[PDB]
Design a protein around this nucleic acid. Structure first.
Ligand SMILES: [Ba+2]
Length: 615
DNA sequence: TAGCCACGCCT
DNA sequence: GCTGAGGAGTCT
DNA sequence: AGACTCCTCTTT
DNA sequence: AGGCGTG
């Protein structure tokens, strides 16, 4: 462990995936050997590879490579990696567009000149398109350009794409069990370790649980490769959207929409369809559906609202993939029909079916009910009685609103510089709550985590723990997390409800002491300032409330994890607390948020929206 | 749709 | 658009 | 000269 | 004011 941080982290990944019997079925021998080859390198040889694996994939000037901590002179090390088959040298640098790319605009000028036919000025981009048109006609002069371009660029290494590929697939796999260590790190461009992972994994200590895998996710190394392909596609589409190239993204999508209807009969699907949901998210079909969702987003941006409706109706026609997404869809469907396609007939059928789908929850549920009333009680609609149709009167109860002012300067205010939220925490200090946290959902989530820790990492649920560095059972964000643990859950949620404020102070003390540091997705250790703070807070919150919140989180974290209030403020001595949703000059309450506030009131908790106006 | 935010537009 | 901080190279 | 784009390194 | 999009 004179291994620097980035190497320790890389090794954990390799180990974690290599000890999966199931995972190792999806690598041929050729592939498997490369890993051995890695392990065979010297410590130096390894350090340097990780560095370069992490760097962008392409050619690097030998003079641009400095790691003192690896060695003062890296030529030996490079030679090892070359011989090993991991790194290639300027010697294999053959493509012109590659040689040019590697050179600086300065150098590009020096070659634009010492070639008489070249206009020595313009951008770097131009001089390239130039030198490439020239070598394409008079080929024999092109080989002389390349000859110098090379000699001019210098000594240069590149990571070999082939072995690289194996490590990315390993990284990909590591990342399913770490939720998705990132779609951006693993799934796109190509796999590197996320920043946080690369830094911390080597030090991280995980909650103890029992690995118990009883089902395969992938049929064979082929299924993996098809999945990896869909993954990369979704990544490149998301990437396009991000860079605003909505035209490219529409193609890319349609492209993928073919391929998916191409796979729609293949043997493998039968088995995937059959997986429990918490695993079904790791299949081609799930990724293709996810892609089709982005596609309706794209149809929407390009304002093609008829198509988007078709696509939404397609997605909703099946319950196989992404059922957690139907709420987003039904809502999105209805919004399109009502707003954009003014078809008031379907808007109702839509809203009706949607609200009859036990799949839709919280925010979207509310948002459909709200459109219903706005619609039924509208004259532009009155010539009907098809929405009086027994709509359960989910009239989200009304909440105390409050307003304060702050001197404006994400929006920054002054009081020293601070946030909308910090400004309010102040108003509340002078309102006689000496104590507060700005924690949004993590305050509550880590309390749920502290109180149910042992039930979460409980033994006896097949398939939820598949390997070594999990921070949660894979079914955590499913309807099955609760069903698979009903009896234990009902029991614990009851105890908590009746617990007096010392049993709580004690249960928390317990987990805290036994688990402090351990990486669990629900628990932020620095979220409270000390164990003592946590105990204060639970004391104020009290069982019935602590129970109610925990019940929602475990029952349906997927759809309840967001829209809890920004602030918790309590009075130390008086034990009175308030749950505050800060609303700066430019944001209102989302449906998710008005559900939470309602539900927190029912639990009998002081809830308040605190509007901030600027000066 | 990951969720957030600031802005801007329409009604 | 954003989800971090600094430096080197490119652009106009 | 200054603005912006790209890339790397983070830690223990 | 609030519903909706855009980046
Ligand atoms: Ba807020």
């Amino acid at each position: 462990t004179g291994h620097p941080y980035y190497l320790r982290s890389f090794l954990v990944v390799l180990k974690t995936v290599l000890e999966n019997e199931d995972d190792m079925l999806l690598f041929d021998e050729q592939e498997k050997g490369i890993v051995t080859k890695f392990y065979q390198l010297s410590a130096t040889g390894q350090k340097l590879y990780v560095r370069l694996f992490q760097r962008k994939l392409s050619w690097i000037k030998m003079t641009k490579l400095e790691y003192e901590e690896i060695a003062l002179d890296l030529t030996p090390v490079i030679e090892e990696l070359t011989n090993a088959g991991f790194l290639q040298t300027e010697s294999e640098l053959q493509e012109l567009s590659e040689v040019l790319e590697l050179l600086s605009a300065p150098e590009l000028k020096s070659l634009a000149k010492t070639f008489h036919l070249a206009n020595p000025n313009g951008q770097k981009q131009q001089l390239v398109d130039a030198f490439l048109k020239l070598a394409k006609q008079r080929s024999v002069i092109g080989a002389v350009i390349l000859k110098r371009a090379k000699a001019l660029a210098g000594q240069s290494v590149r990571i070999c794409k082939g072995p690289r590929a194996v490590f990315s697939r390993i990284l990909l796999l590591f990342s399913l069990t770490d939720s998705m260590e990132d779609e951006d790190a693993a799934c796109g461009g190509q796999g590197q370790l996320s920043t946080v992972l690369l830094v911390n994994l080597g030090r991280m200590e995980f909650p103890s649980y029992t690995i118990n895998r009883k089902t395969h996710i992938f049929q064979d190394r082929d299924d993996l490769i098809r999945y990896a392909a869909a993954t990369h596609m979704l990544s490149d589409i998301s990437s396009a959207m991000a860079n605003g190239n909505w035209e490219e993204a529409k193609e890319l999508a349609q492209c993928a929409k073919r391929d998916w209807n191409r796979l729609k009969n293949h043997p493998s699907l039968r088995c995937h369809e059959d997986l429990p949901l918490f695993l079904r998210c790791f299949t081609v079909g799930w990724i293709y559906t996810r892609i089709l969702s982005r596609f309706v987003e794209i149809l929407q941006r390009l304002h093609m609202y008829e198509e988007a409706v078709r696509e939404l109706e397609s997605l909703l026609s099946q319950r196989i993939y992404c059922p957690d997404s139907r709420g987003r869809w039904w809502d999105r469907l209805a919004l399109n029909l009502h707003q954009h396609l003014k078809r008031l007939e379907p808007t109702i059928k839509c809203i009706t079916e949607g609200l009859a789908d036990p799949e839709v929850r919280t925010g979207h549920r509310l948002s459909l009910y709200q459109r219903a009333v706005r619609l039924r009680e509208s004259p532009s609609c009155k010539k009907f009685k098809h929405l009086f149709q027994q709509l359960p009167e989910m009239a989200v109860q009304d909440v105390k609103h409050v307003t304060i002012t702050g001197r404006l300067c994400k929006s920054v205010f002054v009081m020293v510089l601070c946030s909308v939220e910090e400004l309010a925490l102040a108003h509340y200090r002078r309102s006689g709550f000496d104590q507060g946290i700005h924690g949004e959902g993590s305050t509550f989530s880590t309390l749920y985590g502290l109180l149910l820790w042992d039930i979460i990492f409980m033994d006896g649920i097949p398939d939820v723990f598949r390997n070594a560095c999990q921070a949660f059972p894979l079914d955590l964000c499913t309807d099955s997390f609760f069903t698979s643990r009903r009896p234990a859950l009902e029991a614990r949620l009851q105890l908590i409800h009746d617990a007096p404020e010392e049993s709580l102070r004690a249960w928390v003390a317990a987990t805290w002491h036994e688990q402090e540091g351990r990486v669990a997705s629900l628990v932020s250790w620095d979220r409270f300032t000390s164990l003592q703070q946590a105990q204060d807070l639970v004391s104020c919150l009290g069982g019935p409330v602590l129970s109610g919140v925990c019940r929602h989180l475990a029952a349906d974290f997927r759809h309840c994890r967001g829209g809890l209030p920004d602030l918790v403020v309590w009075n130390s001595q008086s034990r009175h607390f308030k749950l505050v949703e800060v609303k700066g000059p430019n944001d209102r309450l989302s449906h998710k948020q008005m559900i939470w506030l309602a539900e927190l009131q029912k639990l009998g908790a002081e809830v308040e929206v605190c509007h901030v106006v600027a000066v």
